[model samples]
Target: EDHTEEINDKIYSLNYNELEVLAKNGETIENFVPKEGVKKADKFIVIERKKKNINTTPVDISIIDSVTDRTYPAALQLANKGFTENKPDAVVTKRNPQKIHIDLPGMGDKATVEVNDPTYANVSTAIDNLVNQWHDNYSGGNTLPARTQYTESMVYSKSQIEAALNVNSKILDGTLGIDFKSISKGEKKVMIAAYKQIFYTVSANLPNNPADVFDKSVTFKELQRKGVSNEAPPLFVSNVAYGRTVFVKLETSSKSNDVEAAFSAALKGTDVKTNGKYSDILENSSFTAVVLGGDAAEHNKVVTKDFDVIRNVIKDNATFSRKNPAYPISYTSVFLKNNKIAGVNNRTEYVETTSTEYTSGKINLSHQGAYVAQYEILWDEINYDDKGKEVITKRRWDNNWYSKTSPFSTVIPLGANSRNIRIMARECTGLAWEWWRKVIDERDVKLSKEINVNISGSTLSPYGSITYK
Candidate 1:
């Protein structure tokens, strides 16, 4: 079973456009039948009428919907002449419940066409149109030159002018109007500046800016140096030569006190006779080997003993247990300076042989040194600069140390222009010692040695090994 509701005359429904066209064609509609199921209400139906011809053309008068409270789809509408003139101040475009009404003038007068002439007009559309016109004329692409030119000078009525002024004044201070020429010129300037900003740049290969080029080139060359340097294996040779380790064994009858005393004597550069002793072994030598000492009881029981051990030794032992005499790491070159076998100089020199020729044409000649030898030292210092920022400065210096004295006292040595110079480096004095000490201090580890002790009945014997590192 289905229910049917009674249809009323006022509630007639039809397609809005279909009815609008029929109404325009003068068709009379008396009865209506709605489609079954889910039909739109008759309230939304548009009641369009044919435009009436009038002898008085429309005088374009803008109907601005300002702060309007209209509920119709068409937010703005043309007002009747009486209302427009009589209540000009109170002419708010509010939708009426009855219908959307456009007030017309009496036949005697020329009708003022509300610029909100169409059904759909609102402040939003008005603003869009206003900005579009301004852009086309001045800020953007002006398609119609003739129309834009005409608009610039065409007379606008006082009301129209006043409304335009108030519209712009509300947006920003002062009445805004586009001066096409001035705006176009400023736009051209801005475009030119942008073009220069984009194109004005230093080329990568032929760079002109010295600072930029130097920085980039240095970074590039540093990578190149590292690449080349990495291709070859780095060789490290120690400054200390001919390192050796000597061990002494003790008898089973060594006492703890005697063994400790013997170990201390060995570390302090004292000569002590051991069961296996050599004359040249302990003389002028540094403690470079790890030393350890164990009790005879522990040694006899243990099959394997870890010799690597540590115990406190005296600080700054005067002579290294394994010290070797210092020898020149690099030699200074003897070259021809001013045609004589010469010493160090900073100026350019020529390598040429000197010959003594007799009248008989027999000659005695000596060949000059072909290379100027120079040695380098690693230099490092920590100090504060003028501004007192903590700084660690590092560099290499020539063995020909700088002189700060009188005028001739600054005699810079003359050297080879290209071929006669060679640079060699010596380990910084006590560099390894300082480094080892620093490491030990940082780890809070003390320099240590091991002394092996043996005791049987009353007699005691002790011997041990010591390491420098």
Candidate 2:
């Protein structure tokens, strides 16, 4: 329905000055004007005052080498893969241990065997004690007869001391399980062979007879010369006593048919005249073994003393037995992992402080992983001499990895010409497992600067100077 009302004479008239302005305080009248579309009914307006919102996300990083187009996932891998050859230098494992094997030469069963294992410290102490006491006795004016030489290699030297100490180092702390058996005949032959093996194998220096006291300190040349009889086997057994002196002697019985009957008889200062025939009681009944440190001289005038302690120490550590199938075979292995190296830190900046105002520079290198423990940086500064010759001076800095954030850095203060300075990074890994397992890697970087400084008096200016050399 439509309805209409006529104003007629009720219409009111208004002047232009009587109308009020409807715009906001800072707004102009032109802002309310519409476009030339000329349609008041179609007009639409929008007013907005909004703030910015941020989004959270992680960014991926990558590294690429000039030699190849391949990109690595992390900066650390880029430095590590280039030098390490992608492998560890060594791997160690406690899963497999080393074992020492022993066997007899030709004796059948009927022989008893025992083994003693000691540390290098134990053997070293014994040698030093023996040497010290012997010298003391000689100085006291109690002149004992100088014993005849046993083997040329038996003379004592520093080298022999080291060797004797070294024997125990090779054997780990464990029992060398001994085996017992019997031999039909010639038990003395088996005993002599066993003593010879123990002496040559365990003693580093074939030291001379410890029972004899020499007037002067032995010389290296004397120790080197071969003895009177090179045919007799070397033995390390020594006897010590507190009386006038005590000497340890290794006993070997020889029959008429023995290969070197004359040499064997002379060793005991006995001949067929007094000790002609072998007594059943002394022949093959009992086998006694003992090892002494050295000869010592002392007494109470009537004083009684015990020297068995030193003998017992050595006897308990030496191992001797018939060869058998009880020996062990061991397998050993080692492994490495978690190896990484960090990229070098390259940065430049200018600072002004109360103490000084200058340009500061820093270069750093960092690394991670079990195998990457230590590092060294060799810095080379190449400058021209007065004659235009290249002068290269080098400086080296060494560091070790103790934690994840430990890094190596160098600082260059103001006014110093840091240009033409190059750095070579080098490091070694795999020292923990074995000496031969170490792997060393090195890389060099010739620093390139993007800006050059031009200083005249106190005024300074910077410009871009690009050069290949």
Candidate 3:
């Protein structure tokens, strides 16, 4: 065989250029170089591209974190590894076959979950449609997703919305071979108990170690206030960055082969701890039935793999739900004496084009004197830290938000005060969008300044910032 020709043949229809673009695209992806004396690391994208060429099914999952416009590794793990820790943040399957491009969460709201399996299509399609409608009703930009690439996270609002929506009842019931039952929690393991369980119950069930199955993106972070009297525990979920909430993905969305085994391992963890406090998988073996509990009908149902049956229960043990709010009108134009932050034409260059950009080509943001005339305010949630210290949580983007043409000079609300609030300026319309390019790739702006309350005085010729209740 010719040397170059054989090399091409080996990559499974992938030429050097296509593979090279993904490798050198300036993102941190697993690479595929020649094997030398050293051992090779796990080849994620390399195998994926080849599998696509080999005619094996490829389920494309690209979850962009809404908080930080970064790629979420957990979504990739679910795409590649089959099993996820819990339910995904949100699932929006594509409606249009020709144009299913979900680019960024922070950029815009247009998205479609591309799970191309007969089993998943039946369930996710209806859920995605309702969730998509809610977004359209709130923000009203139901355009197609953009063509971009990144791994990231989004808020669980859509998931919460879907959990509350009326999906195909057949899909929710066992009729379609999907189950929506809440998974029973396992009692925390003691040392001697695991030894007995392994010897008696799991002697024959030789499954892959929990380590092999999971790409640990989040940890079991049970948030509690560190005090004898304080019984209040915040959300009992795992977190990434010690900030944003990363929900465990569900197994039903999987299009990979390993997911079946991956889910089986998740139900009953390896007999012993492979490593730390929790199993490498999102869920440790907390659900293991004692003595295999093989005979118990209840226990048997808990471990069944016959159908994808699990509730989207949050780490807090609360079912996913949504809040109803009347569609409030946009705020009228008000002068912001203390507002100095301006939106940009491009982050790289110096251009004052905040109010002059396009969602509609008309005067955007605010055509007023300020750099960022129009803005959306995001208030953070109050949460507790590991040490039980009170903390202001990070802001998240979701369907419901407060966007104003002009902001009143009143103090921001007590719960969502200036200390915890941030703003999106100009182009980042809280919808799926690709910002206008200015020779360099420019992203939107997040502006913040801590003014707990508007300075209470009208004495100066101009006054301080004003926020409303």
Candidate 4:
């Protein structure tokens, strides 16, 4: 919210450990928001998007002030000025309004700065001074010194290096080693640089002699003392903040031994799974979602959605005009951020929906029934031993026949266990799907306006509530 580029959970694509480090580094909301209480607070973290783009590492050249001697101040300058790489080739066309390309990488091939005999102390030293003044000019969120901390080296994936060599087997076999200073191979292959940064470069296509590539430097010479700037670099400021969400539940052993396991389990995951065998929420349902920043954003989003639902349902008067009283409905948070793809790294946090506690009037909800005429006919063949003329082995009947007749469980046996019986029940009835749909739709729901409620204790549970219609 503070910066224009909206960074969501996707920024936390780093694994659990990486996310934890960022969190510990104070780039997440969990570092700020307290877990308890009803107090409200809203503040967003900041990240520098690549609208203007930056080099991962800026090349800082350090040359000996005198050819024979090189000692700290006597040899290298402190703060350099405007000397950047050349004005880079204008590859990307989108004009950035918030950021500017510090162009100095690609200005060549024509009449440019015709200072040929420029010495290192004048041309290079002057450039350093220019950059120092520039950074001192336009600074925002966290300036260069702080931003430097966020800079890090990225490792190339193994596949990338393999693919690079596969293009030419001769390079891998050692029969075709290359020297950039001369090209005896085909086409005089010249190394081409694709991406350039203030201090770093991303070479999409590499030359045979990558070792020969060297970064240009920025060394400064102070006019006042003929020395460098004595000030220290600023603290690190991350262009991106990282956070995490994991449900830790009370493992059976911990629940008995550790009192703090409940909250821990809520933040972490218990050893649970879903295969139609376990009824535990963590195991049976999909609560293993990882979140960033304790899922506060997701929580906020759910509250917003529920607000819309409540507003639309109450005001618009949509369906299920019931016969029995209904209760207030609440929901958990489901925060969404576009990661590499949509719905990536999304997490849902379960929470109570309503904040207001006063009870209202009772309105009875209705009992609905399926239309009898809507039943369909189903046929099945059950074959027994043929010794007794096959024992009435086949039948075709409508759902009406089963509705008024014996239970289907008694008629057919899929397996010999209660779990199997439940599975069969699932096949017969889409109860879970129906219930979930009803929850969202609020269909046939009756409202209760009068009720006394109190919340207390360390765990924050409802102390007292009674229904009287």
Candidate 5:
């Protein structure tokens, strides 16, 4: 629940007053209230109250868009569905753990086909064809995803930034999440509006048609006029916006999840005893995956080096095998769930002492930023729109990025710009990763073997149900 009254127009924990004072002041007591309703007085003093109750998960997504007029719903559907359609074709299982050898009684021995090259056999060719067929089917439809481009939009300007800063000083406060109330100060928002005029003309071909959004209006004239052929017009404009690129920040280093870990412990371990559930549980979902932070000593081994140097190494040795491509996928961090402990200080607060008015201390989470792991996303099934068109394209996160030992201006601090933009070598680094994956994939294919199993009678009868890729 919100605090009864703002201390100096700012929030403070309920522990700020007692029951008798609350009653005298005609304010509701913060104690004995449900934990899920609590908000942190400030990030310095994180909300550590436990809220341990079960609730349905809200749609888990974050988008850079107009909060008032959202384009996210349609975009999400496209990306998720497209990824699902192609995943099965991409899946190639190299191991068979359930195979068995048996001789059928009185059966003329199971038919064994001998071939010098198994990869070219009829069964193998059929499997390969099906795989290629689905891959092509899915990729063709996905090249131009729905919601890939939204109408051009703009935000507030620089003067607006300063004005907003003057009005909502709260955002400037060293906290993690944004507080909208504190940000409503500026009279106007300054934004450079850019409309996405998407059209198909080869590279980055885009499908056009969302309620007749496309309008073909163009004017062409030549300026150099030579007697017979009149000169063309000097100014030329078209409906389509070309070479549109949006800036984004990618985490070079993993984030420290210590705060979240401590927060989880207080709520999951103790808060559940009193409160029915944790706050934000309504916004969470069962699809939740638990991860633990990595060990600093071990993780620092690679993270401490300049990211560019390592990136170049990966770029130079690019491979092209399907299973072991040279380029690596984006690194999404994870943590070990079982390692986190309870009864630890998970709070960070500013305290007053006899000598000093303000002092800072933090409740350390057990894991370091480097101890991250990766979680594979399930891409075979998700919702699609009426046209059988998929929406959600991709989902990812990078925690503890800026603090990692790197030479680049890795992070674009929140509020520093109207939106989060990257200052790192995003394009170069990203390309390097995929280039490496290709090199590895090609090498793996050379060293791997493909074998087939035969089962046409007796015990092999039931084996026909098995699926192989």
Candidate 6:
């Protein structure tokens, strides 16, 4: 009665890799039987092959600076005196107060900025300094100094490039290729940049002009910051922090492996894809997603979402809440600055103490201040079936997050000072396979809470807990 072999013979019953291939040739599970004859592919590594010479050698191009010209700095600090996170063209508008645009490029679309906005001049000057510094090194016949360790050139993926560009700006918009001077081709198309201490890998979109061992450049479709194109390559852009650490890693050993090894970036901390598939970026921290295929593959975005913590009144003087017993949550650090609010700075290591308490109880967290932040990131993925046209698959998720904090009780502490707290929380949702997400600028999340110091030997407030369920 079992027809396993019979079904297998009738259908082609290909392997995962094989199925991925036929799915590209317009062949699906329904039509991939026999296919008029044999089962063959143009070698295990078939390429759609673009215009540039498919020369199989990797190239190394050197970036030169003026002799002793180590003055123009590439790494600009991400924040200025007045603003926590500053970038070019990040102008504040009326819609920013309560409205948000969930568009592809802006970080603010997911979060909001300060209540006491910085003067336009400080933000403007900071942006200009970057622009001026960039031009100072890359503009005129390369007005840069001798190459330093951090100033060296390296190749980066479109998503890695987007990670940098999404947060920083070049020439007003996030696009920098328009003004960047051309390097050779191949290995020289992209280079590293830093501002506000965050790493940014800038790419050249100009076509290659190859010769002698082929030093030509080619232009793939731009993951433009504007226009009808509402998609990006399978990029996991993390906005958990504006500043990013750099990590160069090993690519895989398959066909896409060729693309991946040849196309990964040396711009973020240890890349998640290359460093074993297991992901462990501390909450409010992140990594570079080692991409699947080359940049031109047909990419599809899955679902994405976040769940906020539920706050309720436990006592008239104190506050409390617990982690969702059904799933895991994150530790959100509400950084305090100016003795008022330290908009959570991304790459700071300030966990003077660490503890684990997932069970139900009224455990006292020894953090000296407020703690127990919860947030969730859902998923993002890219499919490598580059037939012809580009397609984007999107789906929205809805869960009763508002009605779910019924158990677990933990306390929310208030320090002795009138400090600020950057509380973050979210719920994760997904599908198909691979996980993906692009988060927000932490500085945009600002909360100001006043603390009352008591001399009765016990810290207590009479305010009722703000209930959310």
Clashes of each: 39, 23, 31, 62, 68, 30
lDDT of 2 by residue, 156-185 (tens): 112221122111111111111111111111
Query: Comparing 5 and 6 by lDDT, which wins?
Result: 6
lDDT (Cα) of model 3: 0.22
TM-score of 5: 0.13
lDDT of 6 by residue, 1-469 (tens): 3333332232222122211211111111221111111112211112221211111111111111111011011111111221212211121211111111111122222222221222333322333343344344433433222111222222233222323322222211122231122211121223333221211222111111111001112111111221101111111111111111111222222222222322333233334335432221111111121111111142111111110110010011021111100000000111010111112222211101111111111111111212211222121111224342323232111221222221223344322111122222321223234121212113221112321111111112111112111
Q: TM-score of model 4 relative to the true fold?
A: 0.15
Angstrom error at residue 176, model 1:
24
Cα error of candidate 6 at position 268, Å: 17
Q: lDDT per residue, candidate 4, 265-290, as tens digits?
A: 32222221221222232221111111
Please, what is the TM-score per model? 0.12, 0.15, 0.15, 0.15, 0.13, 0.16
Candidate 2: Cα lDDT at 240: 14
The lDDT of each candidate is 0.19, 0.21, 0.22, 0.18, 0.18, 0.20
Model with the higher lDDT, candidate 2 or 4 = 2
Question: Candidate 5 residues 17-126, lDDT tens each?
Answer: 11111111111223321111111232111111222221111111111111202111011011121111111011111111111111111212221222222111232333
**Largest TM-score belongs to which candidate?**
6
State residue 248's C-alpha deviation in candidate 2, in Å.
99
TM-score-wise, the better of 4 and 6 is: 6
